[PDB]
Amino acid sequence: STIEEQAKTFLDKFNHEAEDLFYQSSLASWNYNTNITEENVQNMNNAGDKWSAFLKEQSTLAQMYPLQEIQNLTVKLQLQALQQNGSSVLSEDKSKRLNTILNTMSTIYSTGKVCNPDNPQECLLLEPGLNEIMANSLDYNERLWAWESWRSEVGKQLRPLYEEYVVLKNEMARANHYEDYGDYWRGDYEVNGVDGYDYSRGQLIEDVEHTFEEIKPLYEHLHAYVRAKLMNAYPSYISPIGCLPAHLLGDMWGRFWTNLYSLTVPFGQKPNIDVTDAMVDQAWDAQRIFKEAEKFFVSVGLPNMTQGFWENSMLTDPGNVQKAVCHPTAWDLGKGDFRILMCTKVTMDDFLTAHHEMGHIQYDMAYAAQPFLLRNGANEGFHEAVGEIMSLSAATPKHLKSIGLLSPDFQEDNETEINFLLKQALTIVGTLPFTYMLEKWRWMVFKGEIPKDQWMKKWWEMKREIVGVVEPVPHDETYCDPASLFHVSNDYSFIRYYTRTLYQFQFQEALCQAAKHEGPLHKCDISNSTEAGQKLFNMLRLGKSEPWTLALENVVGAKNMNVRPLLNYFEPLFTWLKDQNKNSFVGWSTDWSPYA
Amino acid sequence: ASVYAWNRKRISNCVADYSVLYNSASFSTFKCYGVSPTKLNDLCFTNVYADSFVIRGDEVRQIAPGQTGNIADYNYKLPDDFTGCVIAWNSNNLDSKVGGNYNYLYRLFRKSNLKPFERDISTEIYQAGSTPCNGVKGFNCYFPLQSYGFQPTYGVGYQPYRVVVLSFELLHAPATVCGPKKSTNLVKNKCVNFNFNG
Numbered sequence: 001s002t003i004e005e006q007a008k009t010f011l012d013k014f015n016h017e018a019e020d021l022f023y024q025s026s027l028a029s030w031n032y033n034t035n036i037t038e039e040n041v042q043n044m045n046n047a048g049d050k051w052s053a054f055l056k057e058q059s060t061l062a063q064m065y066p067l068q069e070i071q072n073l074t075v076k077l078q079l080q081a082l083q084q085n086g087s088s089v090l091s092e093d094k095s096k097r098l099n100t101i102l103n104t105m106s107t108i109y110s111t112g113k114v115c116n117p118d119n120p121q122e123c124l125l126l127e128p129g130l131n132e133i134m135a136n137s138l139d140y141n142e143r144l145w146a147w148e149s150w151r152s153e154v155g156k157q158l159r160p161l162y163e164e165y166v167v168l169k170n171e172m173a174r175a176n177h178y179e180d181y182g183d184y185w186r187g188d189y190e191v192n193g194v195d196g197y198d199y200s201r202g203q204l205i206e207d208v209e210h211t212f213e214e215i216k217p218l219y220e221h222l223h224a225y226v227r228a229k230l231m232n233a234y235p236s237y238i239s240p241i242g243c244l245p246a247h248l249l250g251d252m253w254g255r256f257w258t259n260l261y262s263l264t265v266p267f268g269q270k271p272n273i274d275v276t277d278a279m280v281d282q283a284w285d286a287q288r289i290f291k292e293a294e295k296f297f298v299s300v301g302l303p304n305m306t307q308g309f310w311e312n313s314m315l316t317d318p319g320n321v322q323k324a325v326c327h328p329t330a331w332d333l334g335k336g337d338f339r340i341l342m343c344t345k346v347t348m349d350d351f352l353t354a355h356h357e358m359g360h361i362q363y364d365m366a367y368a369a370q371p372f373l374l375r376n377g378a379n380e381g382f383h384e385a386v387g388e389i390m391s392l393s394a395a396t397p398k399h400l401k402s403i404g405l406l407s408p409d410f411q412e413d414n415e416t417e418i419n420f421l422l423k424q425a426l427t428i429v430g431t432l433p434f435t436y437m438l439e440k441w442r443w444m445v446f447k448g449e450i451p452k453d454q455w456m457k458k459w460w461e462m463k464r465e466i467v468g469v470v471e472p473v474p475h476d477e478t479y480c481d482p483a484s485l486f487h488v489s490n491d492y493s494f495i496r497y498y499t500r501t502l503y504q505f506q507f508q509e510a511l512c513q514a515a516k517h518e519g520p521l522h523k524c525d526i527s528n529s530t531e532a533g534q535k536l537f538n539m540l541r542l543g544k545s546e547p548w549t550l551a552l553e554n555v556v557g558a559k560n561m562n563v564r565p566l567l568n569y570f571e572p573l574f575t576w577l578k579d580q581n582k583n584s585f586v587g588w589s590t591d592w593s594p595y596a
Numbered sequence: 597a598s599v600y601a602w603n604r605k606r607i608s609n610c611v612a613d614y615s616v617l618y619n620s621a622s623f624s625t626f627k628c629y630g631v632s633p634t635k636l637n638d639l640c641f642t643n644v645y646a647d648s649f650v651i652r653g654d655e656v657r658q659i660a661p662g663q664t665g666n667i668a669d670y671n672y673k674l675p676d677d678f679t680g681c682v683i684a685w686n687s688n689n690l691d692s693k694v695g696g697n698y699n700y701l702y703r704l705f706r707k708s709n710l711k712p713f714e715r716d717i718s719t720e721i722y723q724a725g726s727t728p729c730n731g732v733k734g735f736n737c738y739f740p741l742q743s744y745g746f747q748p749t750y751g752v753g754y755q756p757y758r759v760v761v762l763s764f765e766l767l768h769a770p771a772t773v774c775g776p777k778k779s780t781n782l783v784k785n786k787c788v789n790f791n792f793n794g
């Protein structure tokens with residue numbers, strides 16, 4: 001009869017057939033990931049083509065129902081999600097060109113091999129070897145060679161491709177009633193139609209700047225401390241008044257600073273909190289790791305894993321004969337089928353990753369009641385954030401002592417908390433300026449603020465201004481330095497890490513306040529608290545049915561993203577860094593003082 | 597059978613032993629409405645209707661008086677004044693294949709809700725809009741029966757469950773489906789209470 005009832009029946013038929021097709025596609029992808037064989041690749045390609053064609057046909061058919069005659073919020077949300085053209089609005093030639101460009105960028109990044117001139121008999125790929133070289137070397141010219149050679153080859157190959165990519169994506173986005181591709185990415189956080197909880201695309205950049213302005217003193221102090229320690233490690237390269245050399249940050253691109261913990265340790269004399277040896281001595285299998293994680297999740301009041309999870313997951317490397325992707329990934333295959341694909345080793349990192357992925361599984365299980373097209377997080381930040389809070393809680397010494405992995409007579413003094421907080425800052429705080437600078441640069445590129453001939457001159461200027469990292473040698477416009485990273489080269493949003501990082505500490509403060517924890521925020525464990533689990537599950541059950549602002553009100557009691565929980569988390573470390581930086585100068589100069 | 601074309605077997609003129617069914621550990625749901633399982637083995641009824649079908653794990657709750665859902669509204673409807681038992685058990689072993697078993701269907705749409713104990717086996721295209729379907733599944737016109745792709749690796753809420761609903765009615769005809777009668781070791785030459793043949 002009415003348009004709303006027609007849309008509801010169409011959504012019901014769509015959900016029913018979509019869930020089955022998504023299951024078939026997801027199962028084919030799972031069979032490829034756990035078994036890399038050519039027939040599995042063919043099955044994955046066939047299932048993906050069927051899934052894409054089905055999404056194209058339902059997108060074509062969903063648009064015939066006008067949005068303004070529907071009053072139900074959930075139905076309008078599903079219809080808004082389905083009615084996106086995607087690449088279909090663009091011409092077939094340009095769509096094929098864009099797909100070809102994406103595929104060739106994927107092949108160039110995945111199979112990119114670079115080695116030293118005059119010794120070309122064997123070369124190293126980035127993921128097997130260059131990462132280890134960047135993470136472990138202490139040699140200035142070797143790191144400089146690897147960084148410059150990889151950016152030379154990858155940037156010179158990818159620069160015309162990126163120039164075509166920005167134009168095609170901007171054309172598609174403006175054809176879809178967006179300002180640019182950056183507006184298309186920012187549209188994920190857009191809430192329209194809800195009274196009071198509306199959020200605009202333009203508000204996101206202002207909120208990110210407002211939070212980053214408060215992030216900046218802590219990052220400046222951390223940068224000064226890391227600069228002083230790197231000056232101790234490398235005597236002449238680093239200037240007291242200038243920025244850090246780009247190739248000395250411990251990773252290939254500067255994404256994380258977690259590989260500088262050895263060089264920048266506050267108290268080397270004190271022991272670490274490594275629990276690897278304890279699991280090795282007691283013969284803890286990966287199955288025991290996941291059972292302990294399940295015990296942690298039942299302690300807080302969340303549902304335990306299904307029998308199908310234990311039966312169908314691959315929690316150990318299969319063997320030499322069968323090849324599998326080693327990256328830990330949680331799979332929500334559909335129809336109540338939840339699996340984890342991780343090649344689990346006996347390490348602390350794998351244990352925390354197991355907690356993180358089981359948090360992903362719990363989040364997936366929670367919104368199973370929702371309709372198929374709403375079975376996602378409210379935004380891209382929440383999905384990662386709910387795993388990261390488990391990663392925070394599991395890593396605490398109280399959790400390790402409770403489960404027996406740490407000695408009951410371990411002395412928790414201030415020095416171990418300071419060095420642990422510094423490691424957490426290098427992993428978590430350090431990625432925030434890089435993420436903000438990269439996303440702001442990409443937004444300015446899509447918006448047309450920066451012309452193509454001035455991309456790099458602004459970019460390094462941004463990096464000195466924001467990240468406090470100086471280029472080793474000046475780069476001209478023949479380079480394509482941003483596209484050397486996995487996410488940007490393969491058409492992925494990057495603001496999810498920034499939002500995840502802020503939401504992580506906001507959720508952590510909310511659950512710790514719910515659990516009546518009486519100490520420091522970093523010493524908080526959310527085990528044994530039913531009320532904290534209930535407060536979490538209230539947001540978890542919603543999925544994408546409600547706005548992210550309402551979900552944040554449900555958890556933390558605020559209608560906007562907040563920066564205060566992160567600063568509260570690192571407050572002992574902030575005071576310690578302020579004490580240690582009395583002689584040194586906090587802040588950096590954008591001039592070429594260290595090296596150029 | 598499928599939930600829409602649910603099989604109905606009329607059971608008459610025999611002895612129904614309900615204790616064998618009740619004491620089995622193979623059944624997940626044995627919810628009786630309108631009568632208790634303990635006194636079923638004694639009572640007698642004129643006819644027994646055994647309706648058999650397959651539904652999902654999460655859809656077992658909808659087979660009850662006064663409930664709502666796709667199965668109750670469009671596939672199998674129970675009366676509010678229902679006397680009988682709903683028995684459900686997991687059948688992932690038999691009704692699921694690795695490729696997907698598409699032999700089980702459900703009616704997804706209909707203009708009006710079903711009456712109690714009604715079967716709809718029509719395969720006419722559902723009309724959700726003003727436009728006539730004309731036998732083609734085009735815009736606003738969808739096919740009523742949809743398959744459940746039962747696979748063994750499904751969750752417990754999506755695995756196939758075989759449901760048998762027993763309906764007990766009393767009519768003015770002589771009741772012939774009576775519960776089994778238990779007989780003791782005969783004792784002779786003593787003053788005893790005898791109940792030979794009622």
Ligand SMILES: *[C@@H]1O[C@H](CO)[C@@H](O)[C@H](O)[C@H]1NC(C)=O
Pocket residue numbers: 035037322
């Ligand atoms: C993996 O693929 C090979 C290819 O023939 C097959 O023989 C094997 O059974 C598969 N293993 C699993 C666990 O699927």
Ligand SMILES: *[C@@H]1O[C@H](CO)[C@@H](O)[C@H](O)[C@H]1NC(C)=O
Pocket residue numbers: 008072073074075
């Ligand atoms: C919106 O639709 C859902 C299912 O489509 C329904 O459960 C809900 O009650 C509806 N809300 C309103 C306000 O009509």
Ligand SMILES: *[C@@H]1O[C@H](CO)[C@@H](O)[C@H](O)[C@H]1NC(C)=O
Pocket residue numbers: 063083084085089176177
């Ligand atoms: C999708 O593209 C078609 C083709 O121009 C257009 O008519 C339609 O409005 C687009 N959808 C949306 C939601 O803008």
Ligand SMILES: *[C@@H]1O[C@H](CO)[C@@H](O)[C@H](O)[C@H]1NC(C)=O
Pocket residue numbers: 304305306307
């Ligand atoms: C989950 O918990 C319930 C009740 O505590 C238990 O019966 C069930 O066996 C558990 N699941 C698994 C897979 O052990």
Ligand SMILES: *[C@@H]1O[C@H](CO)[C@@H](O)[C@H](O)[C@H]1NC(C)=O
Pocket residue numbers: 414415418576
């Ligand atoms: C730790 O505490 C002791 C005694 O309270 C103090 O002497 C020491 O300086 C503190 N260290 C740090 C890093 O706060």
Ligand SMILES: *[C@@H]1O[C@H](CO)[C@@H](O)[C@H](O)[C@H]1NC(C)=O
Pocket residue numbers: 299402527528
């Ligand atoms: C949480 O509960 C378990 C089970 O009673 C207990 O063993 C554990 O010690 C508790 N955690 C804490 C921190 O007391």
